[PDB]
Amino acid sequence: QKNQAVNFLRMSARVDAVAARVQTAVTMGKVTKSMAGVVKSMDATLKTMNLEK
Amino acid sequence: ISALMDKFEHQFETLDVQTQQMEDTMSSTTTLTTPQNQVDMLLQEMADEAGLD
């Protein structure tokens, strides 16, 4: 029982780590998409709003 | 009947050898998780102080 406790708990560690980096990957994804969004909408609204007018 | 009974002895005898075999491979597969040394020191640990509480 005790050595199993060690083994499992170790798996918990490493799997948790990958879980963290995947988390970062997803949130990074959201930020990227949304940012693309603002760059575009702002761009097509920068074409008819171009500074001279 | 008597025949059925010696047949009985032989039968569950084979049960016991099946048991023994099974538990040999079954206990030699997971055996990394139960060292002999560790168990020795444990059993000793609870030997010397066994009834002292």
UniProtKB/Swiss-Prot annotation, chain A:
Signal peptide as annotated in the record: none
Localization: Cytoplasm, Cytosol; Endosome; Late endosome membrane
Top-level taxon of the source organism: Eukaryota
Disulfide bonds, paired cysteine numbers: none
Tissue expression as described in the entry: Widely expressed. Expressed in pancreas, kidney, skeletal muscle, liver, lung, placenta and brain.
Assembly behavior: Probable peripherally associated component of the endosomal sorting required for transport complex III (ESCRT-III). ESCRT-III components are thought to multimerize to form a flat lattice on the perimeter membrane of the endosome. Several assembly forms of ESCRT-III may exist that interact and act sequentially. Interacts with CHMP1A. Interacts with VTA1; the interaction probably involves the open conformation of CHMP1B. Interacts with CHMP2A. Interacts with VPS4A; the interaction is direct. Interacts with VPS4B; the interaction is direct.
Role according to the record: Probable peripherally associated component of the endosomal sorting required for transport complex III (ESCRT-III) which is involved in multivesicular bodies (MVBs) formation and sorting of endosomal cargo proteins into MVBs. MVBs contain intraluminal vesicles (ILVs) that are generated by invagination and scission from the limiting membrane of the endosome and mostly are delivered to lysosomes enabling degradation of membrane proteins, such as stimulated growth factor receptors, lysosomal enzymes and lipids.
Similarity-based family: Belongs to the SNF7 family.
The protein, known as: Charged multivesicular body protein 1b
Species in which this protein is naturally found: Homo sapiens (Human)
Gene: CHMP1B
Residues of the full protein shown: 58 to 110 of 199
